[PDB]
């Protein structure tokens, strides 16, 4: 879906070549419960990098273009979810 | 499926570079209900990005072959659904 | 799959301008109901852009490979279904 | 998966242009029926084509990575299934 | 999924062209039971090829972007998963 949530993330630096540039952060599909609490999660099985965004906590814009990571990375070689945009909605 | 239907969409300016100059819309794969009722949707996983067609509203043809974005954008490098063509049968 | 249904389709002239050159077709996944009747469909979720072929009413190879379109179309930029090849064999 | 069945298949010279010069054959996920039995398919969805190897019979390593027919026909244009590599191993 | 459990594997020298140079290692996405036995599968259809990185027998990240296998391979042409980077935490 293009909206996803987007969670912070850090670590040692390691990371592909390719994918140097570029932010690591945490996304996951599943957000806020039933409009209630914020929620936990465990798996990171979605990975997206990307810069750092406001409202990227509730929600953000998503894609796998590789059009997303080329602005940033260019000449065209890494794959994966980016944050393209960000919308000025936030959850209150 | 290449038959979706194309919702309205305007916020403020905020894309991705290679996706500007293409306007951002909503898509959705379900439409009318039993041929009845226009119905209405919430959630927007699916977002598309195109010129205004008409019968967009209604049905439209949708592709996310990159090839519909490049004669748009060109140069290659956004990736995402886009209407390539239009139906000129509409909804009575 | 590599077997698939083609369907006769036309209309006013229009299509992306990539996919300008190629007819257009409509495919369905679905055939022959148990070996019997030939049954019919309304759904077009399925679009296939291909040269006419013998025996695509029955059955033809199809395939999203872009060396089918290339060869038609080329310069790479389209992206959809197409008949690369028919089967001599057609059902009796 | 990385392992799957290959059978074989020949038909009157019939191909897309990018698919010549690579023998086309039949795939199949499913083998052996419970380690017994070879077992007979009739739906030939899946279509894989690529050069005769050993143990293709039984199982054999299969990509669609188009770098796969790159070797063979170079010049990136068709997509597909192939026989990157084979297992000396075989059924016995 | 980001992390995936890699299995070591070596064989008799046989791989694609465009796969030489990458060592061949399988990769599967079950891992330890309810955090508990190491667990062992027989099935092989996940294969990725990397260079060899410490805890990988446990968890490492995974990717089937070509920029992973570009630095190693480059030109492009091989398509696979590969270990783009790996986590310092093991388990314990």
């Avoid at 540039?21 to 419960?33: A, C, I, P, R, S």
């Avoid at 465990?42 to 990571?69: H, I, K, M």
Wanted: aromatic residues 6%.
């Amino acid at each position: 879906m293009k909206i996803a949530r987007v969670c912070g993330t850090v670590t040692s630096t390691q990371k592909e070549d390719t994918l140097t540039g570029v932010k690591f952060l945490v996304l996951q599909y599943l957000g806020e419960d039933h409009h209630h609490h914020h929620g936990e999660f465990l798996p990171d099985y979605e990975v997206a990098a990307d810069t750092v965004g406001a409202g990227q906590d509730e929600w953000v814009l998503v894609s796998r273009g590789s059009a997303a990571r080329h602005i940033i990375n260019g000449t065209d070689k890494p794959i994966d979810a980016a944050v393209v945009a960000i919308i000025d909605t936030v959850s209150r």
